[model samples]
Target: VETFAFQAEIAQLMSLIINTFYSNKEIFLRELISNSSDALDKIRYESLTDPSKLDSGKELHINLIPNKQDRTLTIVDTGIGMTKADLINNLGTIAKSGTKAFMEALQAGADISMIGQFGVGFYSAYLVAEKVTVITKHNDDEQYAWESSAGGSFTVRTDTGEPMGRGTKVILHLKEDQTEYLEERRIKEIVKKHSQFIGYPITLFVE
Candidate 1:
Protein backbone atom coordinates (compact mmCIF):
# COMPACT_ATOMS: atom_id res chain seq x y z
CA VAL A 1 0.00 0.00 0.00
CA GLU A 2 2.98 2.30 -0.26
CA THR A 3 2.97 4.98 -2.93
CA PHE A 4 5.68 7.36 -4.04
CA ALA A 5 5.35 10.75 -5.67
CA PHE A 6 7.60 12.07 -8.41
CA GLN A 7 9.62 15.20 -7.86
CA ALA A 8 7.91 18.27 -9.27
CA GLU A 9 10.79 18.96 -11.59
CA ILE A 10 10.73 15.43 -12.97
CA ALA A 11 7.02 15.63 -13.62
CA GLN A 12 7.47 18.90 -15.47
CA LEU A 13 10.27 17.41 -17.52
CA MET A 14 8.20 14.38 -18.50
CA SER A 15 5.29 16.58 -19.51
CA LEU A 16 7.55 18.65 -21.70
CA ILE A 17 9.05 15.64 -23.41
CA ILE A 18 5.71 13.98 -24.01
CA ASN A 19 4.19 17.12 -25.41
CA THR A 20 7.01 18.49 -27.52
CA PHE A 21 10.01 16.27 -28.04
CA TYR A 22 9.07 13.22 -30.09
CA SER A 23 8.83 13.80 -33.85
CA ASN A 24 7.83 10.27 -34.91
CA LYS A 25 5.09 8.22 -33.30
CA GLU A 26 6.75 4.88 -34.05
CA ILE A 27 9.57 5.69 -31.66
CA PHE A 28 7.38 4.69 -28.73
CA LEU A 29 7.40 0.96 -29.47
CA ARG A 30 11.06 1.04 -30.39
CA GLU A 31 12.04 2.82 -27.22
CA LEU A 32 9.93 0.64 -24.95
CA ILE A 33 11.03 -2.69 -26.43
CA SER A 34 14.62 -1.55 -26.60
CA ASN A 35 14.41 -0.81 -22.92
CA SER A 36 13.12 -4.34 -22.39
CA SER A 37 16.19 -5.76 -24.10
CA ASP A 38 18.39 -3.63 -21.87
CA ALA A 39 16.72 -5.03 -18.79
CA LEU A 40 17.22 -8.50 -20.16
CA ASP A 41 20.91 -7.77 -20.58
CA LYS A 42 21.04 -6.59 -16.99
CA ILE A 43 19.52 -9.80 -15.65
CA ARG A 44 21.68 -11.94 -17.90
CA TYR A 45 24.83 -10.26 -16.63
CA GLU A 46 23.69 -10.67 -13.06
CA SER A 47 22.86 -14.31 -13.69
CA LEU A 48 26.43 -15.04 -14.73
CA THR A 49 27.39 -14.44 -11.12
CA ASP A 50 24.16 -15.65 -9.50
CA PRO A 51 22.34 -18.06 -11.73
CA SER A 52 19.55 -18.44 -9.21
CA LYS A 53 18.51 -14.85 -9.80
CA LEU A 54 16.64 -15.71 -12.94
CA ASP A 55 13.48 -17.33 -11.60
CA SER A 56 11.41 -16.24 -14.56
CA GLY A 57 11.61 -19.78 -16.10
CA LYS A 58 12.71 -18.54 -19.50
CA GLU A 59 15.51 -16.94 -21.40
CA LEU A 60 15.26 -13.20 -21.95
CA HIS A 61 12.77 -12.15 -24.60
CA ILE A 62 10.25 -9.49 -25.61
CA ASN A 63 6.70 -9.86 -26.94
CA LEU A 64 4.53 -7.39 -28.75
CA ILE A 65 0.75 -7.82 -28.63
CA PRO A 66 -1.34 -5.44 -30.63
CA ASN A 67 -5.03 -5.42 -29.70
CA LYS A 68 -6.77 -3.80 -32.59
CA GLN A 69 -10.19 -3.99 -31.03
CA ASP A 70 -9.11 -1.99 -28.02
CA ARG A 71 -6.59 0.13 -29.86
CA THR A 72 -3.79 -1.00 -27.57
CA LEU A 73 -0.28 -2.32 -27.89
CA THR A 74 1.41 -4.32 -25.14
CA ILE A 75 5.12 -4.84 -24.73
CA VAL A 76 6.09 -7.63 -22.34
CA ASP A 77 9.41 -8.93 -21.12
CA THR A 78 11.05 -11.52 -18.97
CA GLY A 79 13.73 -9.48 -17.32
CA ILE A 80 14.52 -7.64 -14.11
CA GLY A 81 11.50 -5.89 -12.72
CA MET A 82 11.37 -2.53 -10.98
CA THR A 83 10.94 -2.09 -7.27
CA LYS A 84 9.17 0.86 -5.78
CA ALA A 85 12.39 2.79 -5.49
CA ASP A 86 13.27 1.75 -9.01
CA LEU A 87 9.90 2.96 -10.26
CA ILE A 88 10.32 6.35 -8.63
CA ASN A 89 13.94 6.71 -9.62
CA ASN A 90 13.53 5.25 -13.09
CA LEU A 91 10.13 6.30 -14.41
CA GLY A 92 10.12 9.63 -12.63
CA THR A 93 13.55 11.01 -13.38
CA ILE A 94 16.54 10.97 -15.68
CA ALA A 95 20.30 10.31 -15.50
CA LYS A 96 20.34 7.29 -13.21
CA SER A 97 21.56 4.03 -14.72
CA GLY A 98 23.85 1.13 -14.03
CA THR A 99 24.62 1.22 -17.76
CA LYS A 100 25.86 4.78 -17.78
CA ALA A 101 29.32 3.51 -18.61
CA PHE A 102 27.91 1.29 -21.34
CA MET A 103 25.81 4.20 -22.59
CA GLU A 104 28.72 6.59 -22.45
CA ALA A 105 30.91 4.15 -24.31
CA LEU A 106 28.34 4.05 -27.08
CA GLN A 107 28.00 7.80 -27.00
CA ALA A 108 31.71 8.37 -27.47
CA GLY A 109 32.03 8.07 -31.26
CA ALA A 110 29.82 5.01 -31.57
CA ASP A 111 26.34 4.86 -33.06
CA ILE A 112 24.49 5.94 -29.95
CA SER A 113 21.58 6.96 -32.07
CA MET A 114 20.08 3.51 -31.61
CA ILE A 115 20.42 3.81 -27.87
CA GLY A 116 17.86 5.88 -26.08
CA GLN A 117 18.87 8.99 -24.14
CA PHE A 118 17.83 8.51 -20.48
CA GLY A 119 14.24 9.26 -19.51
CA VAL A 120 13.66 10.92 -22.85
CA GLY A 121 12.91 7.52 -24.34
CA PHE A 122 10.02 6.46 -22.14
CA TYR A 123 8.12 9.65 -22.76
CA SER A 124 8.02 8.79 -26.41
CA ALA A 125 5.25 6.32 -25.56
CA TYR A 126 2.95 9.22 -24.93
CA LEU A 127 3.17 10.07 -28.60
CA VAL A 128 1.03 7.04 -29.40
CA ALA A 129 -0.59 6.24 -26.11
CA GLU A 130 -3.19 8.36 -24.49
CA LYS A 131 -2.37 6.37 -21.33
CA VAL A 132 0.24 3.82 -20.27
CA THR A 133 0.26 1.23 -17.54
CA VAL A 134 3.38 -0.58 -16.43
CA ILE A 135 2.89 -3.79 -14.46
CA THR A 136 6.01 -5.15 -12.91
CA LYS A 137 7.13 -7.68 -10.31
CA HIS A 138 10.58 -7.49 -8.79
CA ASN A 139 12.42 -10.48 -7.38
CA ASP A 140 11.99 -9.26 -3.80
CA ASP A 141 8.58 -7.63 -3.88
CA GLU A 142 4.94 -8.03 -4.85
CA GLN A 143 3.58 -7.19 -8.26
CA TYR A 144 3.07 -3.45 -8.65
CA ALA A 145 1.56 -1.30 -11.35
CA TRP A 146 2.26 2.27 -12.43
CA GLU A 147 0.05 4.34 -14.66
CA SER A 148 0.04 7.72 -16.35
CA SER A 149 -1.50 9.70 -19.15
CA ALA A 150 1.54 11.85 -19.90
CA GLY A 151 -0.07 14.38 -17.62
CA GLY A 152 1.52 16.11 -14.65
CA SER A 153 1.08 13.19 -12.23
CA PHE A 154 0.85 9.39 -12.19
CA THR A 155 -0.60 6.66 -9.99
CA VAL A 156 0.92 3.46 -8.65
CA ARG A 157 -0.31 0.51 -6.62
CA THR A 158 -0.19 -3.26 -6.25
CA ASP A 159 -1.45 -5.02 -9.35
CA THR A 160 -4.48 -7.34 -9.55
CA GLY A 161 -3.57 -9.90 -12.21
CA GLU A 162 -1.48 -13.02 -12.09
CA PRO A 163 2.05 -12.02 -11.27
CA MET A 164 4.29 -11.37 -14.26
CA GLY A 165 6.83 -13.30 -12.12
CA ARG A 166 10.09 -11.48 -12.85
CA GLY A 167 9.77 -8.62 -15.28
CA THR A 168 7.79 -5.73 -16.69
CA LYS A 169 4.85 -5.27 -19.01
CA VAL A 170 4.13 -1.96 -20.72
CA ILE A 171 0.56 -1.61 -21.95
CA LEU A 172 -0.16 1.30 -24.17
CA HIS A 173 -3.68 2.60 -24.71
CA LEU A 174 -3.25 4.01 -28.17
CA LYS A 175 -4.64 7.33 -29.24
CA GLU A 176 -6.83 7.71 -32.30
CA ASP A 177 -4.03 9.31 -34.23
CA GLN A 178 -1.69 6.42 -33.46
CA THR A 179 -3.59 3.52 -34.97
CA GLU A 180 -0.65 2.70 -37.20
CA TYR A 181 1.17 1.14 -34.27
CA LEU A 182 -1.56 -1.45 -34.01
CA GLU A 183 -0.56 -2.91 -37.34
CA GLU A 184 1.67 -5.99 -37.22
CA ARG A 185 3.59 -5.11 -40.37
CA ARG A 186 4.34 -1.66 -39.04
CA ILE A 187 5.51 -2.90 -35.64
CA LYS A 188 7.63 -5.63 -37.16
CA GLU A 189 9.35 -3.12 -39.41
CA ILE A 190 10.09 -0.84 -36.50
CA VAL A 191 11.56 -3.70 -34.50
CA LYS A 192 13.70 -5.04 -37.31
CA LYS A 193 14.89 -1.57 -38.27
CA HIS A 194 15.82 -0.20 -34.85
CA SER A 195 16.32 -3.30 -32.72
CA GLN A 196 17.38 -6.24 -34.87
CA PHE A 197 20.62 -6.33 -32.88
CA ILE A 198 19.04 -5.95 -29.47
CA GLY A 199 20.74 -9.16 -28.26
CA TYR A 200 17.52 -10.88 -27.32
CA PRO A 201 14.54 -12.44 -29.05
CA ILE A 202 11.80 -10.04 -30.06
CA THR A 203 8.47 -11.43 -31.30
CA LEU A 204 5.48 -9.77 -32.82
CA PHE A 205 2.00 -11.24 -32.37
CA VAL A 206 -0.39 -11.03 -35.27
CA GLU A 207 -3.87 -12.52 -35.30
Candidate 2:
Protein backbone atom coordinates (compact mmCIF):
# COMPACT_ATOMS: atom_id res chain seq x y z
CA VAL A 1 0.00 0.00 0.00
CA GLU A 2 1.19 3.51 -0.75
CA THR A 3 -0.10 7.03 -0.32
CA PHE A 4 0.65 9.96 -2.57
CA ALA A 5 -0.24 13.62 -2.35
CA PHE A 6 -1.91 15.17 -5.36
CA GLN A 7 0.21 17.66 -7.19
CA ALA A 8 -0.66 21.29 -6.40
CA GLU A 9 -2.31 21.67 -9.77
CA ILE A 10 -4.22 18.43 -9.38
CA ALA A 11 -5.54 19.44 -5.99
CA GLN A 12 -6.56 22.87 -7.23
CA LEU A 13 -8.32 21.38 -10.23
CA MET A 14 -10.18 18.90 -8.09
CA SER A 15 -11.35 21.68 -5.79
CA LEU A 16 -12.67 23.61 -8.77
CA ILE A 17 -14.53 20.61 -10.16
CA ILE A 18 -16.08 19.78 -6.85
CA ASN A 19 -16.97 23.34 -5.89
CA THR A 20 -17.83 24.88 -9.21
CA PHE A 21 -18.12 22.79 -12.37
CA TYR A 22 -20.48 20.08 -11.11
CA SER A 23 -23.06 22.07 -9.24
CA ASN A 24 -25.89 19.83 -10.41
CA LYS A 25 -24.46 16.93 -8.39
CA GLU A 26 -26.37 14.35 -10.43
CA ILE A 27 -23.82 14.81 -13.19
CA PHE A 28 -21.47 12.71 -11.08
CA LEU A 29 -23.25 9.56 -12.18
CA ARG A 30 -23.27 10.73 -15.77
CA GLU A 31 -19.55 11.40 -15.70
CA LEU A 32 -18.80 8.09 -13.99
CA ILE A 33 -20.92 6.05 -16.39
CA SER A 34 -19.41 7.91 -19.29
CA ASN A 35 -15.96 6.93 -18.07
CA SER A 36 -17.09 3.32 -17.69
CA SER A 37 -18.43 3.30 -21.22
CA ASP A 38 -15.16 4.74 -22.47
CA ALA A 39 -13.24 2.02 -20.67
CA LEU A 40 -15.46 -0.67 -22.20
CA ASP A 41 -14.86 0.83 -25.63
CA LYS A 42 -11.13 0.54 -25.10
CA ILE A 43 -11.31 -3.13 -24.21
CA ARG A 44 -13.65 -3.80 -27.11
CA TYR A 45 -11.22 -2.18 -29.55
CA GLU A 46 -8.25 -4.02 -28.06
CA SER A 47 -10.13 -7.32 -28.26
CA LEU A 48 -10.35 -6.92 -32.03
CA THR A 49 -6.64 -7.65 -32.21
CA ASP A 50 -6.35 -9.63 -28.96
CA PRO A 51 -9.47 -11.53 -28.10
CA SER A 52 -7.92 -12.74 -24.88
CA LYS A 53 -8.09 -9.23 -23.49
CA LEU A 54 -11.65 -9.87 -22.48
CA ASP A 55 -12.84 -12.46 -20.01
CA SER A 56 -14.28 -15.51 -21.72
CA GLY A 57 -18.03 -15.25 -22.26
CA LYS A 58 -18.24 -11.97 -20.42
CA GLU A 59 -20.40 -9.24 -21.86
CA LEU A 60 -19.62 -5.56 -21.42
CA HIS A 61 -22.03 -3.86 -19.05
CA ILE A 62 -22.38 -1.34 -16.23
CA ASN A 63 -24.06 -2.06 -12.89
CA LEU A 64 -25.35 0.54 -10.46
CA ILE A 65 -26.18 -0.52 -6.94
CA PRO A 66 -27.60 1.86 -4.38
CA ASN A 67 -27.70 0.77 -0.75
CA LYS A 68 -29.86 2.84 1.56
CA GLN A 69 -28.49 1.31 4.70
CA ASP A 70 -24.92 2.03 3.74
CA ARG A 71 -25.73 5.31 2.06
CA THR A 72 -23.54 4.21 -0.79
CA LEU A 73 -23.94 4.09 -4.56
CA THR A 74 -21.67 1.70 -6.40
CA ILE A 75 -21.00 1.69 -10.12
CA VAL A 76 -19.30 -1.31 -11.63
CA ASP A 77 -18.21 -1.91 -15.19
CA THR A 78 -16.59 -4.69 -17.16
CA GLY A 79 -14.01 -2.60 -18.95
CA ILE A 80 -10.33 -1.97 -19.40
CA GLY A 81 -9.43 -1.99 -15.70
CA MET A 82 -6.49 -0.04 -14.37
CA THR A 83 -3.14 -1.32 -13.17
CA LYS A 84 -1.41 0.17 -10.12
CA ALA A 85 0.70 2.38 -12.28
CA ASP A 86 -2.32 3.44 -14.26
CA LEU A 87 -4.14 4.26 -11.04
CA ILE A 88 -1.32 6.56 -10.07
CA ASN A 89 -0.68 8.02 -13.47
CA ASN A 90 -4.30 8.54 -14.49
CA LEU A 91 -5.97 9.44 -11.22
CA GLY A 92 -3.08 11.13 -9.50
CA THR A 93 -2.23 13.69 -12.09
CA ILE A 94 -4.00 16.70 -13.62
CA ALA A 95 -4.43 17.36 -17.34
CA LYS A 96 -2.19 14.48 -18.24
CA SER A 97 -3.28 12.92 -21.50
CA GLY A 98 -2.30 12.15 -25.06
CA THR A 99 -4.18 15.29 -26.09
CA LYS A 100 -2.82 15.74 -29.59
CA ALA A 101 -3.26 12.08 -30.47
CA PHE A 102 -6.67 11.89 -28.84
CA MET A 103 -7.85 15.02 -30.59
CA GLU A 104 -6.53 13.77 -33.91
CA ALA A 105 -8.31 10.47 -33.39
CA LEU A 106 -11.51 12.34 -32.54
CA GLN A 107 -11.11 14.46 -35.63
CA ALA A 108 -10.73 11.23 -37.59
CA GLY A 109 -14.24 10.31 -36.44
CA ALA A 110 -13.36 7.98 -33.60
CA ASP A 111 -16.66 6.89 -32.11
CA ILE A 112 -15.54 7.15 -28.50
CA SER A 113 -16.73 9.81 -26.02
CA MET A 114 -13.28 10.52 -24.64
CA ILE A 115 -14.74 11.76 -21.35
CA GLY A 116 -11.37 11.54 -19.69
CA GLN A 117 -9.71 13.99 -22.04
CA PHE A 118 -9.37 16.66 -19.36
CA GLY A 119 -8.87 14.21 -16.50
CA VAL A 120 -11.13 16.36 -14.28
CA GLY A 121 -14.61 14.88 -14.56
CA PHE A 122 -13.69 11.98 -12.28
CA TYR A 123 -13.36 14.36 -9.35
CA SER A 124 -17.03 15.24 -9.62
CA ALA A 125 -17.67 12.15 -7.51
CA TYR A 126 -16.49 14.12 -4.53
CA LEU A 127 -19.35 16.55 -4.89
CA VAL A 128 -21.73 13.96 -3.48
CA ALA A 129 -19.41 11.47 -1.84
CA GLU A 130 -17.47 12.09 1.30
CA LYS A 131 -15.24 9.18 0.45
CA VAL A 132 -14.71 7.22 -2.73
CA THR A 133 -13.35 3.73 -3.23
CA VAL A 134 -12.20 2.29 -6.52
CA ILE A 135 -11.50 -1.44 -6.87
CA THR A 136 -10.16 -2.51 -10.22
CA LYS A 137 -8.48 -5.46 -11.89
CA HIS A 138 -6.78 -5.21 -15.26
CA ASN A 139 -6.09 -8.25 -17.41
CA ASP A 140 -2.40 -7.46 -17.15
CA ASP A 141 -2.26 -6.69 -13.42
CA GLU A 142 -3.59 -7.97 -10.12
CA GLN A 143 -6.59 -6.42 -8.37
CA TYR A 144 -6.07 -3.24 -6.35
CA ALA A 145 -8.01 -0.55 -4.52
CA TRP A 146 -7.69 3.25 -4.63
CA GLU A 147 -9.41 5.32 -1.99
CA SER A 148 -9.63 8.98 -1.16
CA SER A 149 -11.65 11.65 0.55
CA ALA A 150 -10.72 14.18 -2.16
CA GLY A 151 -8.49 15.72 0.48
CA GLY A 152 -5.38 16.25 -1.61
CA SER A 153 -4.10 12.69 -1.12
CA PHE A 154 -5.20 9.16 -1.91
CA THR A 155 -4.20 5.63 -0.99
CA VAL A 156 -3.65 2.59 -3.18
CA ARG A 157 -3.18 -1.00 -2.10
CA THR A 158 -3.60 -4.58 -3.24
CA ASP A 159 -7.27 -5.55 -2.97
CA THR A 160 -7.82 -8.79 -1.03
CA GLY A 161 -11.40 -9.34 -2.15
CA GLU A 162 -12.69 -11.50 -4.96
CA PRO A 163 -11.14 -10.38 -8.22
CA MET A 164 -13.11 -8.69 -10.95
CA GLY A 165 -12.07 -10.52 -14.13
CA ARG A 166 -11.49 -7.33 -16.13
CA GLY A 167 -13.23 -4.24 -14.85
CA THR A 168 -13.55 -1.47 -12.28
CA LYS A 169 -15.90 -0.89 -9.38
CA VAL A 170 -16.41 2.50 -7.75
CA ILE A 171 -18.13 2.84 -4.38
CA LEU A 172 -19.15 6.30 -3.29
CA HIS A 173 -20.10 6.99 0.30
CA LEU A 174 -22.83 9.55 0.03
CA LYS A 175 -22.65 12.73 2.00
CA GLU A 176 -25.53 13.59 4.33
CA ASP A 177 -26.63 16.44 2.12
CA GLN A 178 -26.32 14.36 -1.04
CA THR A 179 -28.65 11.53 -0.13
CA GLU A 180 -30.66 12.07 -3.32
CA TYR A 181 -28.07 10.06 -5.22
CA LEU A 182 -29.08 6.99 -3.24
CA GLU A 183 -32.53 6.99 -4.80
CA GLU A 184 -33.11 4.47 -7.57
CA ARG A 185 -35.63 6.69 -9.31
CA ARG A 186 -33.28 9.61 -9.22
CA ILE A 187 -30.44 7.57 -10.65
CA LYS A 188 -32.67 6.17 -13.39
CA GLU A 189 -33.83 9.61 -14.40
CA ILE A 190 -30.31 10.93 -14.51
CA VAL A 191 -29.16 7.99 -16.62
CA LYS A 192 -31.98 8.53 -19.07
CA LYS A 193 -31.17 12.17 -19.41
CA HIS A 194 -27.40 12.04 -19.67
CA SER A 195 -26.42 8.46 -20.48
CA GLN A 196 -29.31 6.83 -22.35
CA PHE A 197 -27.50 6.61 -25.67
CA ILE A 198 -24.32 5.19 -24.17
CA GLY A 199 -23.00 2.16 -26.02
CA TYR A 200 -23.25 -0.33 -23.11
CA PRO A 201 -26.14 -1.65 -21.09
CA ILE A 202 -26.54 0.01 -17.68
CA THR A 203 -28.46 -1.76 -14.95
CA LEU A 204 -29.54 -0.10 -11.73
CA PHE A 205 -30.04 -2.14 -8.57
CA VAL A 206 -32.08 -0.74 -5.73
CA GLU A 207 -32.21 -1.77 -2.06
Candidate 3:
Protein backbone atom coordinates (compact mmCIF):
# COMPACT_ATOMS: atom_id res chain seq x y z
CA VAL A 1 0.00 0.00 0.00
CA GLU A 2 1.29 3.46 -0.90
CA THR A 3 0.08 6.75 0.53
CA PHE A 4 0.09 10.31 -0.84
CA ALA A 5 -1.01 13.61 0.57
CA PHE A 6 -3.19 16.21 -1.10
CA GLN A 7 -1.72 19.50 -2.23
CA ALA A 8 -1.78 22.08 0.53
CA GLU A 9 -4.28 24.27 -1.35
CA ILE A 10 -6.48 21.32 -2.26
CA ALA A 11 -6.86 20.18 1.35
CA GLN A 12 -8.28 23.53 2.38
CA LEU A 13 -10.56 23.70 -0.66
CA MET A 14 -11.87 20.21 -0.03
CA SER A 15 -12.72 20.90 3.58
CA LEU A 16 -14.59 24.03 2.55
CA ILE A 17 -16.27 22.51 -0.51
CA ILE A 18 -17.59 19.50 1.33
CA ASN A 19 -19.25 21.74 3.85
CA THR A 20 -20.35 24.77 1.83
CA PHE A 21 -19.54 24.21 -1.83
CA TYR A 22 -22.47 22.35 -3.31
CA SER A 23 -25.67 23.81 -2.00
CA ASN A 24 -27.74 21.15 -3.71
CA LYS A 25 -26.64 17.87 -2.21
CA GLU A 26 -27.94 15.75 -5.09
CA ILE A 27 -25.56 17.48 -7.50
CA PHE A 28 -22.89 14.99 -6.51
CA LEU A 29 -24.62 12.27 -8.51
CA ARG A 30 -24.72 14.49 -11.57
CA GLU A 31 -21.01 15.23 -11.31
CA LEU A 32 -20.22 11.55 -10.90
CA ILE A 33 -22.26 10.45 -13.90
CA SER A 34 -20.80 13.30 -15.92
CA ASN A 35 -17.30 12.15 -15.08
CA SER A 36 -18.12 8.62 -16.19
CA SER A 37 -19.53 10.02 -19.39
CA ASP A 38 -16.26 11.82 -20.01
CA ALA A 39 -14.29 8.61 -19.38
CA LEU A 40 -16.41 6.69 -21.88
CA ASP A 41 -15.91 9.49 -24.36
CA LYS A 42 -12.15 9.25 -23.88
CA ILE A 43 -11.99 5.56 -24.82
CA ARG A 44 -14.26 6.02 -27.82
CA TYR A 45 -12.09 8.83 -29.04
CA GLU A 46 -8.89 6.85 -28.44
CA SER A 47 -10.20 3.80 -30.28
CA LEU A 48 -10.33 5.92 -33.42
CA THR A 49 -6.52 6.03 -33.55
CA ASP A 50 -5.68 2.93 -31.50
CA PRO A 51 -8.12 0.11 -32.18
CA SER A 52 -6.63 -2.00 -29.39
CA LYS A 53 -8.52 0.10 -26.88
CA LEU A 54 -11.70 -1.62 -28.03
CA ASP A 55 -10.45 -5.01 -26.85
CA SER A 56 -12.93 -4.65 -24.02
CA GLY A 57 -15.89 -4.48 -26.46
CA LYS A 58 -17.95 -4.89 -23.30
CA GLU A 59 -20.61 -2.50 -24.50
CA LEU A 60 -19.94 1.03 -23.35
CA HIS A 61 -22.36 1.82 -20.55
CA ILE A 62 -22.67 2.95 -16.95
CA ASN A 63 -24.34 1.18 -14.06
CA LEU A 64 -25.22 2.20 -10.53
CA ILE A 65 -25.17 -0.38 -7.77
CA PRO A 66 -26.53 0.49 -4.37
CA ASN A 67 -25.77 -1.98 -1.62
CA LYS A 68 -27.59 -1.48 1.62
CA GLN A 69 -25.82 -4.38 3.26
CA ASP A 70 -22.48 -2.63 3.05
CA ARG A 71 -23.76 0.92 2.68
CA THR A 72 -21.88 1.57 -0.53
CA LEU A 73 -22.97 3.07 -3.84
CA THR A 74 -20.89 2.04 -6.81
CA ILE A 75 -20.95 3.83 -10.14
CA VAL A 76 -19.34 1.58 -12.74
CA ASP A 77 -18.43 2.47 -16.27
CA THR A 78 -17.19 0.52 -19.25
CA GLY A 79 -14.88 3.26 -20.38
CA ILE A 80 -11.29 4.37 -20.54
CA GLY A 81 -10.09 3.79 -17.01
CA MET A 82 -7.20 5.34 -15.11
CA THR A 83 -3.70 4.04 -14.68
CA LYS A 84 -1.98 3.92 -11.29
CA ALA A 85 -0.23 7.16 -12.11
CA ASP A 86 -3.55 8.79 -12.89
CA LEU A 87 -4.87 7.62 -9.52
CA ILE A 88 -1.87 9.08 -7.76
CA ASN A 89 -1.73 12.38 -9.59
CA ASN A 90 -5.36 13.08 -10.42
CA LEU A 91 -6.48 12.76 -6.83
CA GLY A 92 -3.25 12.77 -4.91
CA THR A 93 -2.08 16.03 -6.45
CA ILE A 94 -5.15 17.94 -7.52
CA ALA A 95 -3.13 21.12 -7.89
CA LYS A 96 -1.92 19.76 -11.18
CA SER A 97 -5.43 20.59 -12.41
CA GLY A 98 -6.97 24.03 -12.72
CA THR A 99 -6.31 25.00 -9.13
CA LYS A 100 -6.08 28.64 -10.04
CA ALA A 101 -9.43 28.67 -11.83
CA PHE A 102 -11.02 26.63 -9.06
CA MET A 103 -9.88 29.13 -6.51
CA GLU A 104 -11.11 32.01 -8.62
CA ALA A 105 -14.47 30.31 -9.06
CA LEU A 106 -14.76 29.89 -5.32
CA GLN A 107 -14.15 33.55 -4.62
CA ALA A 108 -15.94 34.84 -7.71
CA GLY A 109 -19.17 33.16 -6.59
CA ALA A 110 -19.47 31.20 -9.81
CA ASP A 111 -22.22 28.63 -9.80
CA ILE A 112 -21.34 25.71 -7.60
CA SER A 113 -22.84 23.52 -10.27
CA MET A 114 -19.83 24.31 -12.45
CA ILE A 115 -17.40 22.32 -10.40
CA GLY A 116 -17.19 20.50 -13.68
CA GLN A 117 -16.06 23.72 -15.34
CA PHE A 118 -13.68 24.19 -12.47
CA GLY A 119 -12.51 20.64 -13.22
CA VAL A 120 -12.85 19.62 -9.61
CA GLY A 121 -16.00 17.58 -10.04
CA PHE A 122 -14.43 14.42 -8.64
CA TYR A 123 -13.93 16.01 -5.29
CA SER A 124 -17.70 16.29 -4.99
CA ALA A 125 -17.50 12.72 -3.69
CA TYR A 126 -16.86 14.18 -0.29
CA LEU A 127 -20.24 15.86 -0.41
CA VAL A 128 -22.10 12.79 0.82
CA ALA A 129 -19.41 10.23 1.43
CA GLU A 130 -17.18 9.59 4.37
CA LYS A 131 -14.81 7.85 1.98
CA VAL A 132 -14.30 7.42 -1.76
CA THR A 133 -12.77 4.38 -3.51
CA VAL A 134 -11.92 3.91 -7.16
CA ILE A 135 -11.08 0.59 -8.79
CA THR A 136 -9.83 0.99 -12.32
CA LYS A 137 -8.24 -1.02 -15.13
CA HIS A 138 -6.92 0.32 -18.38
CA ASN A 139 -5.72 -1.41 -21.51
CA ASP A 140 -2.23 -0.10 -20.81
CA ASP A 141 -2.33 -0.96 -17.13
CA GLU A 142 -3.49 -3.60 -14.65
CA GLN A 143 -6.08 -3.05 -11.97
CA TYR A 144 -5.50 -0.70 -9.05
CA ALA A 145 -7.67 0.74 -6.31
CA TRP A 146 -7.44 4.29 -4.96
CA GLU A 147 -9.06 5.42 -1.75
CA SER A 148 -9.45 8.56 0.32
CA SER A 149 -11.40 9.24 3.48
CA ALA A 150 -11.23 12.94 2.78
CA GLY A 151 -9.04 14.97 0.50
CA GLY A 152 -6.28 15.24 3.09
CA SER A 153 -4.59 12.06 1.83
CA PHE A 154 -5.11 8.98 -0.31
CA THR A 155 -3.90 5.43 -0.84
CA VAL A 156 -3.30 3.36 -3.95
CA ARG A 157 -3.08 -0.43 -3.68
CA THR A 158 -3.01 -3.25 -6.16
CA ASP A 159 -6.18 -5.29 -6.29
CA THR A 160 -6.02 -9.07 -5.90
CA GLY A 161 -9.71 -9.70 -6.56
CA GLU A 162 -11.13 -11.34 -9.66
CA PRO A 163 -10.03 -9.57 -12.79
CA MET A 164 -12.53 -7.16 -14.30
CA GLY A 165 -12.84 -5.63 -17.74
CA ARG A 166 -11.19 -2.40 -18.81
CA GLY A 167 -13.15 0.28 -17.02
CA THR A 168 -13.62 1.94 -13.65
CA LYS A 169 -15.82 1.67 -10.60
CA VAL A 170 -16.27 4.48 -8.10
CA ILE A 171 -17.57 3.22 -4.76
CA LEU A 172 -18.79 5.73 -2.26
CA HIS A 173 -18.93 4.69 1.37
CA LEU A 174 -21.93 6.75 2.37
CA LYS A 175 -22.09 8.71 5.54
CA GLU A 176 -24.82 7.52 7.90
CA ASP A 177 -26.92 10.57 7.09
CA GLN A 178 -26.65 9.85 3.39
CA THR A 179 -28.21 6.39 3.38
CA GLU A 180 -31.05 7.79 1.31
CA TYR A 181 -28.84 7.50 -1.77
CA LEU A 182 -28.86 3.72 -1.21
CA GLU A 183 -32.53 3.54 -2.16
CA GLU A 184 -33.11 2.43 -5.76
CA ARG A 185 -35.97 4.83 -6.39
CA ARG A 186 -33.99 7.79 -5.12
CA ILE A 187 -31.04 6.96 -7.32
CA LYS A 188 -33.24 6.26 -10.29
CA GLU A 189 -34.87 9.62 -9.88
CA ILE A 190 -31.50 11.25 -9.73
CA VAL A 191 -30.42 9.58 -12.95
CA LYS A 192 -33.62 10.56 -14.64
CA LYS A 193 -33.29 14.12 -13.54
CA HIS A 194 -29.67 14.70 -14.46
CA SER A 195 -28.58 12.09 -16.99
CA GLN A 196 -31.66 11.20 -18.98
CA PHE A 197 -30.19 12.67 -22.17
CA ILE A 198 -26.70 11.30 -21.64
CA GLY A 199 -25.31 9.28 -24.55
CA TYR A 200 -24.81 5.97 -22.75
CA PRO A 201 -27.45 3.99 -20.93
CA ILE A 202 -27.32 4.20 -17.15
CA THR A 203 -28.84 1.28 -15.23
CA LEU A 204 -29.32 0.56 -11.58
CA PHE A 205 -28.23 -2.94 -10.50
CA VAL A 206 -29.06 -4.51 -7.19
CA GLU A 207 -30.11 -7.74 -5.39
Clashing pairs in 1: none
Compared with the true structure, all predictions reach lDDT values of 0.74, 0.80, 0.84
Q: Candidate 3, residues 1-207: lDDT per residue as tens digits? A: 998888876777678767783557778889899989999999999999998889876588999999999999999999999998788775545554565677787688776667777667877778889999899998989899988887588889998876777889999999898999998889989888988888999989966
lDDT of 1 at 92: 44
The digit string of per-residue lDDT tens for model 2 on 1-207 reads 899887666666556545653356776788899889988998999999998886532699999999988999999999998999888875554344433344455468642234355445676787788899999988889899999887788899999998678899999999998888888789989999988999899999868
Model 3 pairs whose backbones collide:
none
- Cα-based TM-score, every candidate: 0.83, 0.85, 0.92
Q: Which number leads on lDDT? A: 3
Clashes of each: 0, 0, 0
The ten-residue window of minimal lDDT in model 3 covers 90-99
Q: In what order do the candidates fall by TM-score, top score first?
A: 3, 2, 1
Model 2 spans with C-alpha error above 4 angstroms: 18-23, 90-117
lDDT of 1 by residue, 70-137 (tens): 88899999988888877766554453341343345444853323336554467667767888899998
> In model 2, which residue pairs have backbone atoms overlapping below 3 Å?
none
